[PDB]
């Protein structure tokens, strides 16, 4: 709506914004992340992982 500036999801986290100059609606998504798992055989067998 013309009077609305930001946006929030169900858990009250910003996920949209209006550009101050061009007045465009831009989506915001966090950059990727995750865990790291290492698969190895017995260390007395080899050193490849």
């Amino acid at each position: 709506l013309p009077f609305q500036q930001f946006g929030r999801d169900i858990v009250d986290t910003t996920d949209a914004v209006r550009d101050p100059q061009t007045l465009e609606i831009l989506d915001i998504t966090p950059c990727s992340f995750g865990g790291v798992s290492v698969i190895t055989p017995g260390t007395n067998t080899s050193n490849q992982v």
Binding site: D9, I10, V11, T13, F33
Partner: peptide, 27 residues
Amino acid sequence: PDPSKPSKRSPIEDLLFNKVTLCAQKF
């Protein structure tokens, strides 16, 4: 099991899987 269905599930299992229905974001 019903061979016609691509998932190879019995009709009762199909109804059981369709009955249960499961947010899912904001990592």
